Amino acid sequence: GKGSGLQGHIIENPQYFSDACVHHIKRRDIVLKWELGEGAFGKVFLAECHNLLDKMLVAVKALKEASESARQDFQREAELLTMLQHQHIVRFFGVCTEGRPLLMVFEYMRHGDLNRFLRSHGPDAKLGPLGLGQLLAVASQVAAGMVYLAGLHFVHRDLATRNCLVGQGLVVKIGDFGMSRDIYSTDYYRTMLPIRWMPPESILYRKFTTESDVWSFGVVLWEIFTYGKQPWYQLSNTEAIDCITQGRELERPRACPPEVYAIMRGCWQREPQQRHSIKDVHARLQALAQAPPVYLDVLG
Numbered sequence: 454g455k456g457s458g459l460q461g462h463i464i465e466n467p468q469y470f471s472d473a474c475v476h477h478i479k480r481r482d483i484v485l486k487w488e489l490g491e492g493a494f495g496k497v498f499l500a501e502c503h504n505l506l507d508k509m510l511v512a513v514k515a516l517k518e519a520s521e522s523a524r525q526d527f528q529r530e531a532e533l534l535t536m537l538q539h540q541h542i543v544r545f546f547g548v549c550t551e552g553r554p555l556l557m558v559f560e561y562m563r564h565g566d567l568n569r570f571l572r573s574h575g576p577d578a579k580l581g582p583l584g585l586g587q588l589l590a591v592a593s594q595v596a597a598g599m600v601y602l603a604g605l606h607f608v609h610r611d612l613a614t615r616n617c618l619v620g621q622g623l624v625v626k627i628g629d630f631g632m633s634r635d636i637y638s639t640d641y642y643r644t645m646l647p648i649r650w651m652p653p654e655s656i657l658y659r660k661f662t663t664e665s666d667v668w669s670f671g672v673v674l675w676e677i678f679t680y681g682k683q684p685w686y687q688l689s690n691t692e693a694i695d696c697i698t699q700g701r702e703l704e705r706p707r708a709c710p711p712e713v714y715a716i717m718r719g720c721w722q723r724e725p726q727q728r729h730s731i732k733d734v735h736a737r738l739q740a741l742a743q744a745p746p747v748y749l750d751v752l753g
């Protein structure tokens with residue numbers, strides 16, 4: 454998991470420790486149905502898992518036969534994923550290390566990644582549309598997952614809608630399979646970095662922090678309010694990099710009320726220390742999701 458938030462946390466946290474006691478699933482209890490996605494180092498399948506909770510649907514990541522260091526990384530990642538337990542973090546069920554391929558088992562998120570979900574439920578629908586209340590509920594749930602990660606001093610490093618998943622009844626959780634660099638290659642710039650989601654200190658120094666994650670969340674909000682459009686879509690990577698470092702801001706989306714644009718702007722302060730905390734950003738979004746702004750409302 455080169456440059457993953459999972460490995461970066463293990464490397465950097467001096468108080469972190471974990472024994473090797475992850476939940477093990479017997480290979481015979483996993484029955485693959487069909488492929489969901491493919492990357493350079495793995496494949497993701499939809500599967501049925503017996504004796505897990507009865508017969509239930511899961512997302513299974515299979516590793517393309519790995520070197521000793523790749524197998525050691527698989528183990529490190531599995532231990533940390535066991536620890537990340539939150540209502541808005543994709544649930545990790547365990548591993549299958551008896552025989553090959555090595556498997557990681559996750560809960561199945563039936564509506565797929567949030568970027569595909571937004572694009573298929575918005576204007577000129579990619580093959581019904583999401584209302585403002587639903588867009589705010591999606592934003593508030595990604596914000597809740599980020600509050601949990603910040604509380605652990607866990608830096609995501611790649612927060613974007615492609616790295617969020619959608620389940621039953623509009624449930625949104627942060628989670629990926631580590632293959633967004635292959636599936637969404639145009640969202641990275643070559644060591645591949647998601648520059649369009651990155652603040653100036655991340656581009657300049659490859660510095661990733663809780664504050665760079667807040668900026669990326671501001672970019673996620675803009676993605677949500679444009680129904681999955683790519684930030685700086687009219688520009689090349691080099692022109693986007695110049696916009697970011699020179700202080701150009703993304704425009705207010707048509708579906709975005711001014712009070713919500715103000716939230717994105719608080720995430721986008723060029724000075725990291727001036728960015729709003731994710732706790733405050735989540736509280737305002739949760740309040741708006743339950744009382745959505747109305748165009749031409751009498752405010753007083």
Ligand SMILES: Cc1cc(NC(=O)c2ccc(Cl)cc2Cl)n(-c2ccccc2)n1
Nearest residue numbers: 454457458459530609627628629630631
């Ligand atoms: C290159 C790369 C990036 C990731 N994703 C994360 O590190 C990640 C996953 C989940 C959550 Cl909640 C937060 C984060 Cl930041 N992986 C990865 C490796 C093994 C398994 C699943 C993903 N690999």
